[PDB]
């Protein structure tokens, strides 16, 4: 069901990196990857977990809507985009750790773990997901099949909006797990075409911060190779 | 409250076109046009009516959701992108008039008018560029008399363009039957901490000029520090 495409490995080596790319054809329901064992290999979700978190914040009423403002606490941090007020949409955009940590605290770990367990997500982070596992969660979200309000899922799906043009829409989330060796960077989401939807999940070795861009770059070189995007 | 930046006219003349652009700064509650007269002049809404039409079709349940397929009837119409199955999102993107006609037949002229009159839309049905903004501002704010789900899903279906700088939600109109033949573009642009509603119409002497609807608008957004 998951075909392997060695020919994708050149994109990682051309950028002198290692990683995995997992595609899912929704109409056909075939998976495609450059490496299965790493595809099914589980890592920390670092910020790709702000997706299910936002669902729980919303569905439990920690977040009224995407317009509600979460003021700055006044503490200058070392990411300047973090030193401002935010709503769920901007907080997702700049991955504002301080904001989502104030969700995790108004919500409690007990509900978190049980709620994330209902999502069938994993198993401070707290859990471990593989790219393949990351795509099965994404498809549930796409189809409003998680057991929370459709309002929650539609709001999160709006906040995942990364890029849209006359040819496709991308809804995704970046991550970077950089507390445990290996440090590894995530990009999971999907690309919406006129008559099909391609899910993807990629992760790769990220010892620096300087290669984060390759997360999207290497993924987009695959989607061109497969003629998915022009 | 409504101001005239006449300097925008160079953008119409530069393509030897004539039209109006109407911008509404949301945070500042102040609006801008290149032509006070033509801004408030009423025109057929032609394809910009698909926004309220979609609202009504969703909120009465004729369309279950943005995924539901409306199969192509089989008539090879002139416009190629119509000749295929669509859903609410692709129907809106390609302005698929026959898909929406089946909506109408389903809903009835009666419920369609009543609702459209609960949206405070038109005045044979006409709407000015400034009037489009008032309606859009109520959709953006989820304040029209239809469910919230309805208004969200339509706002998803209007998505046109998005990057890390801005998001644009809009609908085009092309009207020819009576004169003049005019083009529409109405929508808003979602900034980090503001939103900018816009409604433009213009003279569409030829069909070729269709892309000048977005082009002339963006030159005004670009000229206004709204987009880069
Ligand atoms: C909405 O604007 C739709 N307009 C029409 O279908 C046409 N006229 O609408 C009239 C009758 C004027 C009205 O008052 O409603 C029409 C069909 S053919 C023609 N010369 N005028 C569709 N809107 C759009 C658009 O905004 O661009 C179209 C996209 N398009 C146009 C030409 C070629 C390919 C694609 C189709 S019409
Ligand atoms: Cl959206």
Author numbering:
A (entry chain B): 24 to 146, 159 to 265
B (entry chain A): 24 to 146, 161 to 265
What do the authors say?
Here we reveal how directed evolution of a β-lactamase yielded highly epistatic activity enhancements. We describe how distinct mutations shifted the rate-limiting step from substrate binding to the chemical reaction in the β-lactamase OXA-48, thereby causing strong phenotypic epistasis.
To understand how the conformational dynamics affected the substrate-bound state along the evolutionary trajectory, we performed MD simulations of various OXA-48 variants in the acyl–enzyme complex. These models were constructed on the basis of the Q5-CAZ crystal structure with the unresolved Ω loop taken from the apo wtOXA-48 structure. This increased correlation could be rooted in the increased rigidification of the β5–β6 loop, harbouring the S212A and T213A mutations, which in turn allows for a tighter interaction of the loop with the substrate.
